[PDB]
Motif scaffolding. Structure first.
Motif, PDB file in Angstrom:
ATOM      1  N   UNK A   1       1.753   6.709  -6.627  1.00 34.37           N
ATOM      2  CA  UNK A   1       0.830   7.792  -6.764  1.00 34.37           C
ATOM      3  C   UNK A   1       1.536   9.191  -6.568  1.00 34.37           C
TER       4      UNK A   1
ATOM      5  N   UNK B   1       3.695   1.232  -1.152  1.00 34.27           N
ATOM      6  CA  UNK B   1       4.317   1.177  -2.759  1.00 34.27           C
ATOM      7  C   UNK B   1       3.545   2.015  -3.400  1.00 34.27           C
ATOM      8  N   UNK B   2       1.862   1.531  -3.696  1.00 31.28           N
ATOM      9  CA  UNK B   2       1.200   2.189  -4.355  1.00 31.28           C
ATOM     10  C   UNK B   2       0.881   3.489  -4.198  1.00 31.28           C
TER      11      UNK B   2
ATOM     12  N   UNK C   1       4.030   9.782  -9.716  1.00 28.83           N
ATOM     13  CA  UNK C   1       3.711   9.857 -11.061  1.00 28.83           C
ATOM     14  C   UNK C   1       2.706  11.199 -11.147  1.00 28.83           C
ATOM     15  N   UNK C   2       1.990  11.439  -9.802  1.00 27.03           N
ATOM     16  CA  UNK C   2       1.281  12.791  -9.840  1.00 27.03           C
ATOM     17  C   UNK C   2       1.980  14.040 -10.040  1.00 27.03           C
TER      18      UNK C   2
ATOM     19  N   UNK D   1       3.541  14.322 -13.532  1.00 23.57           N
ATOM     20  CA  UNK D   1       2.528  14.783 -14.277  1.00 23.57           C
ATOM     21  C   UNK D   1       2.075  16.030 -14.336  1.00 23.57           C
ATOM     22  N   UNK D   2       2.235  16.543 -13.160  1.00 22.87           N
ATOM     23  CA  UNK D   2       1.797  17.807 -12.830  1.00 22.87           C
ATOM     24  C   UNK D   2       2.768  18.739 -13.880  1.00 22.87           C
TER      25      UNK D   2
ATOM     26  N   UNK E   1       0.799  -1.152  -0.114  1.00 24.83           N
ATOM     27  CA  UNK E   1       0.084  -0.008   0.022  1.00 24.83           C
ATOM     28  C   UNK E   1       0.901   1.255   0.086  1.00 24.83           C
TER      29      UNK E   1
END
Lengths: 570, 570
Positions: free
Chosen positions: B232, B227-228, B235-236, B239-240, B225
């Motif tokens: 998150x 890890x995910x 990449x968040x 990506x911003x 968890x």
């Protein structure tokens, strides 16, 4: 392909993906509209000099681009949800069956390999397939729209771009296939030469021993020429992709313009329209290139996912019904037992016949390097019994439910792992329940880890930092013996070698050991004479064929392989 | 940076990078020129309705794009030259000094690790720094062009873009730095949690014994968890990255259009020029995103370069220039020797006053893990003489260099790496020179290689697959003894543990030993039982204090650790 075998592991999230698509489409929608703004700009705006619309354009561009952003925001965040959740469930099942696979997956494959597999392959599946959807949908938003853009502006230029789209797309597919071929057929010789240099480096030992420095320099040189030449061909060909593509692609523009005469001979277009047309065409050229690689990405992903599934589709340790076990058994026996630690080359053990009755302390003396721990590991039934039986007090191997079986055994080896946790609870892997803190902490202190418990950081509940910080092999061994004092296996075994000796440590250790072995068997890996004879009894390890059953008390009168264990083997 | 340390390794290829530059500047020229071509279409072509240029220009497009192509052709192929040549020279020197690290220095890393280092880090250095030059030159050229483009069009919108482009650059550098920071902090905690799961894996046996599959699954779940969640966040932010940038660029476009309205109050432009402006602006929007990550990119490259240079900047093995080494018997005699195989991983040996006169056969028995070979392999000074010298015929090891010494001694071990050559030559990696193929091949088949060399593909001068090494460990040792027979170094040391091999193969190897041990010194790693005594002299060592070893006469004379070993422990 096998998204079927995935869709469940996506299903209860699928909603997220849906969300993605929506904004994703909007995303490329934005693209189109931006380009659309050209039409009012050039012909309507500057042609008619209507400074009015020159106030639209600024604001609307800002807005639209903010839309592009907020889409990218949510597209990314949502596909991140689903990717993370997919990784999650995947690694979860994989974890699970991993802890279900027999020692094979750790025999045949190495830890690093598995961990690479988990992290890399899972997130590869996610990343790859996700980006596949991303592109696919991004292409749908872009191509389809841009055609509609063309549509309103000009039936004609559209028609032509459409009829030509097959030509360019086909050319791209063609060159991609060609150069996949050229980039696939290489890999054989690629690995050939690389692994050749690999063996070179692995042999530098024998090299320098034999003084061939001058030779291996030239060999390095030749193979490196092969290397650089391979690289030359690789990058050369693969780099011819873009030119030819954009070359043939450019021809498109040509025809359009070439045949831009006649419809302006029809006076179809005005400037802005034309700009939109050609702009749009290029915009199209981004995703067109993308799409073939899209199918490629599906392939990469689903391939690695099949690697996964195979790792899943491998079979856990098989059981056949053996429920009959408590915590007090007493004796173990080995009838006609064979095992094969390797594949087939060296037979590990053969027709093993051993008998360790209650209290019979045992130290592994025999074929040095025969993996003596195996015999213990056989008591663990870590491997499958190729022949013979472990009659543990009258019942066969297969009358022994694995759960209570492995619960009923204890091993204190030289090298023990723990988990990042309060060392106390790390002792308490036995559910931390049905053993209370008084029991746990007291016995642990009573089990001679006192300088490792009370003196260490935080005393009673000394916590672990980075998994035991710097706890000695001896520290961990004590901790495991403390576990034994906690779990109190009906049968207690351990392994200690000539590593190190702190008088109080190993002395109280062996004291607790004979406490455990009280009317209870025991095995210890024998390299120390001190552990060999501080206890009572010592055995053979008959060099693969252990028909011999018993310790000094048995194998002394027989005069068996004790000949070798006196003079020729140990 | 370390370009100071790398440039010469590029210098004799300068002309390559020069062609690189000129070509790439042409590439940008092609970009810009097409964008310029956009104008006559709009203002003259459709505005003034002159089908003349409607015919001229399309051809120009085809041509220019052809230029793009051929330039990319040559750019790629030329950078390929220089990159390959750099890779080559780098790997060459790295081989060189890679032949200089001590055997430990060989195992301080894993062989695979160093191989990855060679291949990857070399091609990373090249690829990275090359593409860095590519980006710098091309992108800068495109920028400069597009500005000039603007100039031929309008002083005004140019000036404004010049005022603003710095602000864009600032935004990009800013967000890049923020998110580099975030990525680094993650990377730290990333490694934390990933390695945590790694350990969690590596200890199955423990759990499967202690029966905590539930406990694992839970811990697996929590850490996954985490890890995910890290995924998150990573990449968040990453990506911003884009949307903010594109928003700022949007702002640019906007105020460009405001100050397009204002000189439209001046009646600034005409349609074509207008379209050229913003088109060019976007064309610029590709290379700014380039340039920032450019000033980033060297670092990756130059970093791996520093790794390299350090691997170069280790010290090749020290030497003594003592030389003066007999190609004769000499006398091998340890004195006072106290070394360590690793840096400090395990304590090895202490006060080794071992004497082995000319012809005295010796075996290696005792502490399984005392590096018995390392004693022999350190007669080769695989490490340095920490303390206590071996008097080679009245001459210390320190009294002589390594060159002929290592040639003057042989060592037939269990696992002799061979090499991709006419395996007939493989016997003589050092200096196949007048060594009679009659002599070579005979002695080989005389040395009981005959079992297989007679029956290998093509007979006398056979090679095989996998560098002609497809032979088994049996044929390996065979051909190794054959090698001993070729060089016939009157100094003879060997290593055979006949605990593991086929019976007939063993008959052949023992017969060959007989054929080769003519009056000659001998050592053997003794994990054997029978052939320990076929040469009637057997001995043993533990404790790392080898004052007593040698023949069976010396075995009888130990009366210390070693007599006690061969009479009670080995």
């Amino acid at each position: 392909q096998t998204f079927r075998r995935l869709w469940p592991t996506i299903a209860p999230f699928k909603a997220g993906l849906i969300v993605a698509g929506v904004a994703l489409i909007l995303n490329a929608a934005s693209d189109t509209f931006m380009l659309s703004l050209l039409k009012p700009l050039l012909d309507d705006g500057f042609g008619k000099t209507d400074r009015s619309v020159l106030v639209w354009m600024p604001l609307v561009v800002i807005g639209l681009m903010i839309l592009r952003g907020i889409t990218s925001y949510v597209s990314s965040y949502c596909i991140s949800w689903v990717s993370g959740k997919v990784v999650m469930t995947m690694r979860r099942r994989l974890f699970g069956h991993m802890m279900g696979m027999p020692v094979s997956f750790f025999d045949k494959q190495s830890t690093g390999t598995l961990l690479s597999r988990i992290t890399y392959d899972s997130e590869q599946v996610a990343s790859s397939s996700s980006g596949a959807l991303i592109t696919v949908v991004r292409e749908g938003a872009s191509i389809i729209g841009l055609f509609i853009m063309m549509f309103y502006y000009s039936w004609q230029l559209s028609i032509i771009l459409i009829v030509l789209a097959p030509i360019v797309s086909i050319a791209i597919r063609v060159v991609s296939k060609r150069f996949r071929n050229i980039s696939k057929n290489m890999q054989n010789t690629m690995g050939q030469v690389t692994t050749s240099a690999e063996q070179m480096l692995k042999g530098h030992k024998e090299v320098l021993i034999f003084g061939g420095q001058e030779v291996e320099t030239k060999r390095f040189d030749k193979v490196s020429n092969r290397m650089r030449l391979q690289g030359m061909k690789m990058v050369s060909a693969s780099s011819i992709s873009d030119p030819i593509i954009q070359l043939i692609a450019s021809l498109a523009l040509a025809f359009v313009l070439y045949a831009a005469s006649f419809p302006s001979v029809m006076d179809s277009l005005t400037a802005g329209t034309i700009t939109v047309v050609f702009s749009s065409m290029i915009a199209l050229m981004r995703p067109l290139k993308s799409l073939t690689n899209v199918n490629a990405q599906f392939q990469r992903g689903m391939a690695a996912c099949q690697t996964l599934f195979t790792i899943l589709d491998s079979e856990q340790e098989k059981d056949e019904g053996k429920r009959v076990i408590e915590r007090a058994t007493g004796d173990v026996e080995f009838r006609n037992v064979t095992f094969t630690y390797p594949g087939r080359d060296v037979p590990a053990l053969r027709n093993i016949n051993l008998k360790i009755p209650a209290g019979k302390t045992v130290a592994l003396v025999g074929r040095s390097g025969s993996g003596k721990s195996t015999i213990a590991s056989l008591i663990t039934r870590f491997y499958d019994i190729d022949e013979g039986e472990i009659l543990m007090d009258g019942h066969d191997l297969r009358e022994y439910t694995l759960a209570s079986l492995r619960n009923q055994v204890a091993l204190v080896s030289q090298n023990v792992h723990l988990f990042n946790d309060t060392v106390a609870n790390n002792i308490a892997y036995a559910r931390t329940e049905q053993y209370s803190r008084e029991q746990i902490e007291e016995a642990a202190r009573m089990a001679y880890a006192m300088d490792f418990i009370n003196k260490m950081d935080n005393g009673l509940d000394t916590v672990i930092g980075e998994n035991g910080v710097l706890l000695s092999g001896g520290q961990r061994q004590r901790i495991a013996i403390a576990r034994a004092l906690l779990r109190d296996s009906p049968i207690l075994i351990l392994d200690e070698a000539t590593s190190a000796l702190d008088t109080e440590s190993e002395r109280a250790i062996q004291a607790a050991l004979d406490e455990l072995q009280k009317n209870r068997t025991s095995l210890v890996i024998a390299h120390r004479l001190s552990t060999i004879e501080k206890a009572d009894e010592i055995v053979v390890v008959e060099d693969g064929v252990i028909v011999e059953r018993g310790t000094h008390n048995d194998l002394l009168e027989h005069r068996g392989v004790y000949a070798q264990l006196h003079k020729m083997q140990f």
